[PDB]
Amino acid sequence: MQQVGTVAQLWIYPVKSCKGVPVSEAECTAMGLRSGNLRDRFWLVINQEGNMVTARQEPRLVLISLTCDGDTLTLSAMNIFEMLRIDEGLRLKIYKDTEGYYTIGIGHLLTKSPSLNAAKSELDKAIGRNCNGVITKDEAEKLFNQDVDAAVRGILRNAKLKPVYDSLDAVRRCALINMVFQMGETGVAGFTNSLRMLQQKRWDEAAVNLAKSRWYNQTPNRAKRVITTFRTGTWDAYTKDLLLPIKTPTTNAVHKCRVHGLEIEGRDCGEATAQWITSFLKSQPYRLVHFEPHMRPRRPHQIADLFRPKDQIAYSDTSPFLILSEASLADLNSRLEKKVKATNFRPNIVISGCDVYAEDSWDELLIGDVELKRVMACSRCILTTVDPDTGVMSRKEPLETLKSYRQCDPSERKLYGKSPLFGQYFVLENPGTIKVGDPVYLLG
Ligand SMILES: Nc1nc2c(c(=O)[nH]1)N[C@H]1C(S)=C(S)[C@@H](COP(=O)(O)O)O[C@H]1N2
Ligand SMILES: [Cl-]
């Protein structure tokens, strides 16, 4: 027909409320996207009562990734913020660091002055209120995000550190940011020989050389962790990744679970996964389960009667698919102080090349050989405020800004209430494969 956009991103969220997996191609099934062994919201974290655990309860779920390399599933939860939380700790009252300097939060230096008045003046300036030397964890995490971003910006402006940083893989980049956070750019830039070895990928030699430094002697247990990260390119010294086979043994228990009030089964993924998730979240005992295709699916028509009786989902909130356009996202962002990415809204298909909110009027789409049918708008909640990089829920933006201008028409206030609309729910009319780059055609 007529092209109305192009597929820009495809996202599968294998575990409900956890990190998305970007893909260049995906099968469109009646239940949602599939890439190999990963299917959209086919895994679920449950509590001891069998009830879902979502990012409304545990926003740090968004830090967990489940990925698949053909033969093996990997669970991982680490990134620079988590690495530095482990190494820097958390203190909500002004304290003195090991050099005697007034500090607060996650290693946030307030001043080198011996004056407590100066430390408290810096604190109140940085937080924007009269804290009397005490902050909340949310405030400590805000300062932390600022400090990490500043460390990275600084590395990228440093002619000695940028070439090494650019040369490093993602995990080893975190180890370099870690050192800069601890000791500052100039200190790290002084590690001339180790930095050369790192840029040359001489990992064992770099590790041997880094352990001879004053840094190692002053903080040997932290340095040992950072050095292991440089040596191996893994998270072995922090929350170590868990490697699992794709096939869960049928001797594992099947649990009766509850997702948004309705029952659905899942196969327990085993004690290793339960322990790993629970330890990372520091939570009550949780399990991971997986939906198997002989189990009874949940029925979107029971949730919202605009969906067809035949529609089926596993653990998704309501719909097999969520579609969003770049234009819609850019329009929201022009109204926000803190910019957001598509990840906050957890769409499966992001389309470029259209005007704002064009998807709201795309009733029937053809993408590749796949036909999709629009059902209703996606109404948003606090999950959009959960930050994908830090796992910290703002509980405010961007949901407030969306509340300001994206409420549903008065003619439509039975379905959505006052939850703002952002993105569109679609169902499958014809199975097939879609690819990033595919033109999107409006039918009819
Ligand atoms: N396929 C699909 N994507 C979706 C939805 C859905 O129902 N189906 N709900 C959206 C909304 S309103 C929420 S808050 C989050 C929930 O993501 P989760 O089910 O992984 O926790 O998915 C978003 N993307
Ligand atoms: Cl130490």
Q: Is the dihedral of CA 80, 85, 88, 93 positive or negative?
A: positive
Closest CA to 40 of 76, 14, 63, 61: 14
Structure tokens at 217: 């002697």
- The residue behind tokens 């399990």 is 287
What whole-number distance in Å separates Cα of residue 129 and Cα of residue 48? Answer: 41
Whole-number Å distance between alpha carbons of 116 and 134: 13
Cα 308 off chain centre by: 31
Residue type, 330: A
Catalytic residues: 88, 97
Name residue, tokens 């870690």: 178
Question: How many C-beta atoms lie closer than 10 Å to residue 369's C-beta?
Answer: 12
Are 194 and 201 in contact by the 8 Å Cβ rule? The answer is no
Q: Is 34 left (phi over 0), alpha (psi -120 to 50) or beta?
A: beta
What is the C-alpha to C-alpha distance for residues 90 and 102, in angstroms, rounded to an integer?
14
Q: CA–CA separation, 330 vs 156, rounded Å?
A: 26
* Structure-token match 């929350």, residue found: 239
Provide the residues around ligand 2 (an ion) whose CB is within 5 A. 219, 221-222
Q: Are 441 and 353 in contact (CB under 8 A)?
A: no
Chain centroid to Cα 325, Å, comes to 20
Task: Tell me the three-class secondary structure of the chain, residue by residue.
Answer: CEEEEEEEEEEECCECCCCCEEECEEEEECCEEEECCEECCCEEEECCCCEECCCCCCHHHHHCEEEEECCEEEEECCCHHHHHHHHHCCEEEEEECCCCCEEEECCEEEECCCCHHHHHHHHHHHHCCCCCCECCHHHHHHHHHHHHHHHHHHHHHCCCCHHHHHHCCHHHHHHHHHHHHHHCHHHHHCCHHHHHHHHCCCHHHHHHHHCCCHHHHHCHHHHHHHHHHHHHCCCCCCCCCEEEECCCCCCCCEEEEEECCEEEEEEECCHHHHHHHHHHHCCCCCEEEECCCCCCCECHHHHCCCCCCCCCECCCCCCCEEEEEHHHHHHHHCCCCCCCCHHHHCCCEEEECCCCCHHHHCCEEEECCEEEEEEEEEECCHHHHECCCCCCECCCCCHHHHHHHCCCCHHHCCCCCCCCEEEEEEEEEECEEEECCCEEEECC
Cα–Cα dist 103/92, whole Å: 10
**Strand partners for 134:** 93
Residue 229 tokens read as 């990260």
* Closest by Cα among 152, 134, 57 to 92: 134
Rounded Cα gap, residues 263 and 238, in angstroms = 36
Does 115 belong to an annotated binding site? no
Check whether the bond before 300 is cis (ω within 30° of 0): no
Residue ID of nearest Cα to ligand 1 atom 22: 346
Question: Can you read off the two tokens belonging to residue 383?
Answer: 């999950």
Helices 170-183 and 220-232 cross at an angle (nearest 10°) of 160
- Let me know: does 258 contact 87? Beta carbons within 8 Å: no
Residue 322, ligand 1, Cβ within 6 A? yes
Residue 290: how many other CB atoms lie within 10 Å: 24
Q: Which two tokens stand for residue 348?
A: 């499966």
CA–CA separation, 51 vs 281, rounded Å?
A: 16
- Residue 395 assigned to a binding site: no
Q: Does the CB atom of residue 311 touch ligand 1 within 6 A?
A: no
- Please say whether the beta carbons of 364 and 443 come within 8 A: yes
Q: Which two tokens stand for residue 157?
A: 């402006």
Q: Angle at CA 213, nearest 5°, toward 208 and 219? A: 105
- Bridge partners of 289, per DSSP, are 44, 268
Specified resolution (Å): 1.6
The residues near 87 (Cβ < 8 Å, ≥ 6 apart) are 178, 182, 222, 225, 226
In the numeric block, which tokens belong to residue 171?
């995990």
Please state, in angstroms and as integers, the Cα–Cα distance from residue 233 to each residue in 118, 296, 372, following that order: 41, 42, 42
Burial of 5 (0-12, 13-18, 19+ CB in 10 A): buried
The pair of structure tokens assigned to 261 is 């009030």
Give the span between the Cα atoms of 1 and 364, in whole angstroms: 11
Q: Report whether 121 belongs to an annotated binding site.
A: no
Tokens 């795309």 correspond to what residue? 362
Report which protein residue has its CA nearest ligand 1's atom 14: 383
- Nearest CA owner, ligand 1 atom 23: 346
**Residue 52, Cα to own-chain centre: how many angstroms?**
18
| Cβ atoms 30, 426 nearer than 8 A | no
Gap between the Cα atoms of 18 and 57, Å rounded: 12
Distance CA 328, CA 330 (A): 6
Residue 223 burial (10 A CB sphere; 0-12, 13-18, 19+): buried
Exposure string of 186-206, with b = 16+ CB inside 10 Å and e = fewer, is eebbebeebbebbeeeebebb
Residue 15 Cα: closest atom of ligand 1: 20
Method by which the coordinates were obtained: X-ray
**Distance in angstroms (rounded) separating the CA atoms of residues 95 and 103:** 5
- Give the ligand 1 atom nearest the CA of 384: 14
Please tell me the residue having the least CA distance from ligand 1 atom 3: 322
57 CB contacts (<8 Å, ≥6 apart)? none
**CA nearest 428: which of 32, 40, 3, 25?**
32
Q: How far is the CA of 78 from the centre of ligand 1 (A)?
A: 23
Q: Is 193 annotated as a binding residue?
A: no
What order do you get walking across the sheet with 32-35 strand by strand?
Answer: 38-39, 32-35, 25-29, 432-435
Q: Are 107 and 99 contacting, i.e. CB atoms less than 8 angstroms apart? A: no
* The one-letter amino acid at 96: K
Contacts 24+ apart (CB under 8 A), 335-339: 335/401, 335/404, 335/405, 336/397, 336/398, 336/401, 337/397, 338/397, 338/398
CA dihedral of residues 410, 414, 416, 417 (deg, nearest 10): 70
Atom nearest to 33 CA in ligand 1: 1
The length of the chain in residues reads 444
